[PDB]
Design a protein around this nucleic acid. Structure first.
Ligand SMILES: [Mg+2]
Ligand code: NA
Ligand code: NA
Length: 326
DNA sequence: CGGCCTACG
DNA sequence: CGTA
DNA sequence: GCCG
């Protein structure tokens, strides 16, 4: 009944099993912290299956036959249903290791391997890192410097303000170039922790060299706190009433021939994308990324005019962005 | 048993 | 490695 | 951890 890949089923933003999915996502995150990307993936997939169900799970019976539910994920749901809490999940939550790895990996520039090294070295707090600045890359120094602002939810009003200044810079850099909001806000989220924009031009090739010109124009308006091509992972100085706040912004340039692939890629969700690329390769024999869809036997790229074209070619029912919240 | 998205900076 |  |  329930399809096995997240790209085969609609997943709305608001769903009926948040308590269960959040618990499984804690186990997925913890699996990542210990270096098991396979267990992370299963727990993420199991959580995503629950987000796609039409009703609350109230009895263990309702898991029977669901993809990515085995002994472990089922036991977690069982305990939550029976007792309101899962002992394993609570143990993880309260553990010094989980809490510190979560604290460190939330920093822009810090992933699991870096965080794990710092944990093994005895570091535990943001202050501890500030005390040892030579342990930090320039990217990490920026992530730590702006950490409080970057932990503040980005709102739609912020997105609209950012879109206007990005459109202004892009128009100054290249007449006719366009700016498309992607990421979580395109999927309908009302908040986020960053903002993603996709930039192109209707005439193939005109966009060459565009992103450095856009960055210079934003920098000269004082809008850039951190950056450093066709992808830029930035921190903007966003004006506020009487002041300013740092906001994470991703800027991406694509040639228009690639625009539907880049739009599909950068719209996410992250799990949706990896499930879609897995489906493409394992079920259809085609290789998908944010540039194209490649048939490795014919050695040809699919010409797509829209996201719908990409879904149809993969034999998938089209999902609008608001249903890609896997 | 081995696979688990696939790129760019 | 980091980012998505 | 789950699945092909
Ligand atoms: Mg982003
Ligand atoms: Na991080
Ligand atoms: Na985003």
């Amino acid at each position: 009944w329930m399809p096995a890949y997240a790209c085969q089923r609609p997943t709305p933003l608001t769903h009926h099993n948040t308590g269960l999915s959040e618990a499984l996502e804690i186990l997925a995150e913890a699996a990542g912290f210990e270096g098991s990307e396979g267990r992370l993936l299963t727990f993420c997939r199991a959580a995503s299956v629950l987000k796609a169900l039409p009703s609350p799970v109230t009895t263990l019976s309702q898991l029977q036959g669901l993809p990515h539910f085995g002994e472990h994920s089922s036991r977690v749901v069982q305990e939550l249903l029976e007792h309101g809490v899962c002992e394993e999940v609570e143990r993880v939550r309260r553990s010094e290791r989980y809490q510190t790895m979560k604290l460190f990996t939330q920093i822009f520039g810090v992933g699991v391997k870096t965080a794990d090294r710092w944990y093994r070295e005895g570091l535990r707090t943001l202050d501890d890192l500030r005390e040892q600045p030579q342990k930090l890359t320039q990217q990490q120094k920026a992530g730590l410097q702006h950490h409080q602002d970057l932990s503040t939810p980005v709102l739609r009003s912020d997105v609209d303000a950012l879109q206007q200044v990005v459109e202004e810079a892009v128009g100054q850099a290249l007449p006719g170039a366009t700016v498309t909001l992607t990421g979580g806000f395109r999927r309908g989220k009302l908040q986020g922790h960053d903002v993603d924009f996709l930039i192109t031009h209707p005439k193939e090739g005109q966009e060459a060299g565009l992103l450095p010109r856009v960055m210079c124009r934003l920098q000269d308006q004082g809008l850039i706190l951190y950056h450093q091509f066709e992808r830029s992972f930035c921190i903007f100085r966003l004006p506020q009433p009487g002041s300013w706040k740092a906001v994470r912004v991703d800027l991406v340039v694509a040639p228009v021939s690639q625009f539907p692939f880049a739009l599909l890629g950068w719209t996410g969700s992250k799990l949706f994308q990896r499930e879609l690329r897995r489906f493409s390769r394992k079920e259809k024999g085609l290789w998908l990324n944010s540039h194209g869809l490649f048939d490795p036997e014919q050695k040809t790229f699919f010409q797509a005019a829209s996201e719908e074209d990409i879904f149809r070619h993969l034999g998938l029912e089209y999902l609008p962005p608001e249903q890609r919240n896997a």
